[PDB]
């Protein structure tokens, strides 16, 4: 007795989940935070034409720095010291 048809959370007939005041409080909190977010999003500080052409310089320097870092790709340097330090394994006290 007490069986559910098929799976418990899907299909034409499922186990009916219900709401709790815990979830109600949680969601009202989320949405009131979102309402104050709307408020603070309002009243901008500058206009489109005011803010049009100020950051293009910084964006340009950023993109050219990225280009330089990407172009800077080569093999590393090789050195006689790094090569010949492999000879140091056969040392022994005389």
């Amino acid at each position: 007795r007490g069986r559910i048809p098929g799976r418990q959370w899907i299909g034409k007939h499922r186990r009916p989940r219900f709401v709790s005041l815990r979830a109600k409080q949680n969601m009202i909190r989320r949405l009131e935070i979102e309402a104050e977010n709307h408020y603070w999003l309002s009243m901008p500080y500058m206009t489109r034409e005011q803010e049009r052409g100020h950051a293009a310089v910084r964006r340009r320097e950023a993109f050219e720095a990225i280009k330089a870092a990407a172009t800077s790709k080569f093999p590393p340097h090789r050195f006689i010291a790094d090569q010949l330090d492999h000879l140091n394994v056969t040392k022994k006290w005389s």
Partner: protein, 37 residues
């Protein structure tokens, strides 16, 4: 399943929470309008 159904199609939990929070909160005075007034 389909949108319109013969039975009441059980809805998503988020939606059911939203509908359970959104109701007509009747504006009542602190005093009942019969005994005092």
């Amino acid at each position: 399943s389909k949108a319109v159904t013969r039975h009441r199609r059980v809805m998503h939990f988020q939606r059911q929470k939203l509908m359970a929070v959104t109701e007509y909160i009747p504006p009542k005075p602190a005093i009942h309008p019969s005994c005092l007034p």
